[PDB]
Write a protein that binds this DNA or RNA. Structure first.
Ligand SMILES: [Mg+2]
Length: 665
DNA sequence: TGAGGTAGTAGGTTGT
RNA sequence: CAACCUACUACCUC
């Protein structure tokens, strides 16, 4: 429990809502064709937009801060694809209270609309959504870069206004598709139809004749889409989604959409540009003078991290020794021309295993994957002589090969860590992270936490995989007393939402893992989800925990939405806790401007401080980080990576991989 | 594939 | 319409 500190957030307080904004006008709606089922809301919101003025939806009909008489109370609209005649009917005004969150919800919405709408008419200003740009930063040959900020406006509990502000840049081009080539520019990886709004991943060009299943130049004009311009026919792109077959379209009806290559704010300058814009907006909108909102920060007890002895970053366990070594064999695979183990790597590993008192063996695989099945027999044999993981020296592999090889070894129970081939002793940070990764893949506890924490078990949950279906998975850190890191077999699912039965099952695996290292159940576990928790996702798992008499806390850990945190005076410390609302706090562990982790206590009865403590500390357990800690707790960072990697290479291989070998780092 | 991060550019899922 | 998440790319950092 370290020392206080005062900080201000990237929010500001503005003028109290006025007697007229506290009593919104109410209006019912009437659509014809009469509304559907789940089509009502995505549309009742779109009618607030069409109606005009500052109006947002409020129940079955919308609310408005503008009088009905200055609204388009009747008009026409088209939705999913139908002409819907509408008519707004007035039904008096109904006051709202900031204290009553349900209603304060609406005020904040009107407030967000007021924000845009007022911005919409500031001459000399581009409003792309709730974000605004008000300074040019640089230019080129039709390629201009706008400065500005993204912002939100909501209502406080004291019936006052709140404005969140954060600097941003924009990239904008003028020249058409072929008009961008008139500049001599290179092939924009992406583009977007002016006529439509679709973004095509431009593939290449072609001398192919336009007049030459469909007739290009001809049918293109059939939609009367030949007017306005034409230029060089050029590209025959492909749907970014189904990105194979070629579906060509005229390069007169595409607008070039530029990117980074085809400018980084120092926090000191961001805290400046933030206050500037804040003032500016309150001034230009009659919202008043911006009072920077400030909150109490807290410095958090630095973690005591333990190799064989105390250590400050995982890499140092390389010279001190490991929190827990064991007899370990490690094989080598060379996909370049060379034969033996680079001596400095040989030395480096001995020096570390010496220091630990544990015994090492350094095998070599004399085989190439080119051999086919005979190569798998080579693996079968090394795994037989007790190799636990392999290092692979190789020039940069391609994704498709890289995956195939990784997946191959895992089929023989062998985790692999690639180290790319042009390699020199001085590239020390490279190969030491490669070494840590190899040892983690071998099953070794590199470092752990000395300390006492509320929960002896910490499990992270994530879901992911590019494809049509996802995986839901869990990693975990066993025993408060440092950690033992484990992964569990993920399970395939339709969406991001992990199924309840599945959450509990993965959870139960973590529990059982704990039971088998300490002959007892854990008294309390710490549950970590990445991002918003899908409502009720942990329903069963929590009830199940209860009936087993295990204490719990669920925390939602978000990487986005933490906003910004600035020092009132001085420099900010690495480990800062910052309670916000109720049940929600930030955590900052940072040559740019940092993003705080936003954390939400979704369940359980534990001091936000206590949780922030563990969490921040788990940040240090990640064994392949090396010379830098991940922003997220080791057990969550792991679940994130495992789920990604089972995504990349499929679940069928992991049958025979020891759950203590972190193969995915 | 060494790894942590932020920052531009795309975009998908959950949810009322 | 919010709240999160993803992928590229470019930079930094050890
Ligand atoms: Mg790795």
């Amino acid at each position: 429990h370290l020392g206080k500190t005062e900080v201000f957030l990237n929010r500001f307080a503005l003028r109290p809502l006025n007697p007229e904004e506290l009593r919104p006008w109410r209006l019912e709606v009437v659509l014809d064709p009469p509304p559907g089922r789940e089509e009502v809301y995505p549309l009742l919101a779109q009618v607030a937009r069409r109606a005009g003025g500052v109006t947002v939806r409020m129940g079955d009909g919308l609310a408005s801060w503008s009088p009905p008489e200055v609204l388009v109370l009747e008009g026409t609209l088209a939705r999913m694809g139908q002409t819907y005649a509408y008519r707004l009917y007035p039904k008096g005004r109904r006051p709202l209270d900031p204290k009553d969150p349900g209603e304060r919800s609406v005020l904040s919405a009107l407030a967000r609309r007021l924000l845009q709408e007022r911005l919409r008419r500031l001459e000399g200003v581009w409003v792309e959504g709730l974000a605004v740009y008000r300074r040019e930063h640089a230019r080129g040959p039709g390629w201009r870069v706008l400065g500005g900020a993204v912002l939100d406006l909501w209502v406080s509990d004291s019936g006052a206004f709140l404005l969140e502000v954060d600097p941003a840049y924009r990239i904008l081009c003028e020249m058409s598709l072929e008009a961008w080539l008139a500049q001599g520019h290179p092939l924009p990886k992406r583009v977007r139809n002016a006529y439509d709004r679709r973004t095509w991943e431009l593939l290449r060009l072609g001398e192919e004749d336009p007049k030459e299943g469909l007739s290009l130049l001809d049918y293109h004009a059939s939609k009367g889409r030949l007017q306005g311009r034409e230029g060089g026919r050029v590209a025959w792109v492909a749907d970014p989604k189904d990105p194979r077959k070629p579906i060509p379209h005229l390069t007169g009806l595409l607008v070039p959409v530029l990117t980074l290559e085809d400018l980084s704010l120092p926090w000191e300058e961001r805290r400046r540009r933030t206050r500037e814009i804040a003032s500016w907006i309150g001034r230009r909108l009659g919202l008043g003078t911006p009072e920077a909102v400030r909150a109490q920060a807290y410095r958090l007890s630095i973690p005591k991290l333990m190799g064989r002895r105390a250590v400050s970053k995982p890499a140092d366990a390389l010279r001190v020794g490991f929190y827990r070594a064991q007899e370990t064999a490690l094989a080598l695979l060379r996909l370049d021309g060379a034969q033996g183990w680079p001596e400095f790597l040989r030395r480096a590993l001995l020096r570390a295993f010496g220091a630990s008192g544990a015994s090492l063996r350094l095998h070599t695989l004399h085989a190439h994957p080119s051999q086919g099945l005979a190569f798998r027999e080579a693996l079968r044999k090394a795994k037989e002589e007790g190799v636990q993981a392999v290092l692979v020296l190789t020039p940069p592999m391609a994704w498709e090969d890289r995956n195939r090889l990784k997946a191959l070894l895992l089929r023989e129970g062998l985790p692999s860590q690639i180290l790319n081939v042009p390699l020199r002793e001085e590239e020390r940070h490279r190969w030491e992270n490669a070494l840590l990764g190899l040892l983690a893949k071998a099953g070794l506890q590199v470092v752990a936490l000395s300390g006492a924490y509320p929960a002896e078990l910490a499990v992270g949950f994530d879901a992911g995989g590019r494809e049509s279906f996802r995986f839901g998975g869990a990693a975990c850190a066993v025993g408060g007393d440092g950690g033992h890191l484990l992964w569990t077999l993920p399970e395939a699912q339709a969406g991001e939402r992990i199924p309840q039965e599945v959450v509990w099952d993965l959870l139960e695996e973590t529990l059982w893992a704990f039971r088998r290292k300490a002959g007892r159940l854990p008294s309390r576990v710490l549950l970590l989800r990445e991002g918003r928790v899908p409502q009720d996702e942990f329903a069963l798992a929590l009830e199940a925990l209860a009936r087993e008499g295990i204490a719990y806390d669920l925390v939602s850990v978000r990487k986005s939405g933490g906003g910004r945190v600035y020092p009132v005076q001085g420099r900010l410390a690495d480990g800062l806790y910052v309670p916000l609302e109720d049940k929600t706090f930030l955590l900052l562990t940072v040559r740019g401007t940092p993003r705080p982790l936003k954390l939400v206590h979704e369940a359980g009865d534990t001091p936000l401080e206590a949780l922030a403590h563990q969490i921040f500390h788990l940040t240090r357990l990640y064994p392949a980080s090396g010379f830098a800690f991940p922003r997220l707790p080791a057990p969550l960072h792991l679940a994130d990576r495992l789920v990604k990697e089972v995504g990349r290479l499929g679940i069928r291989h992991l049958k025979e991989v020891d759950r203590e070998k972190l193969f995915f780092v």
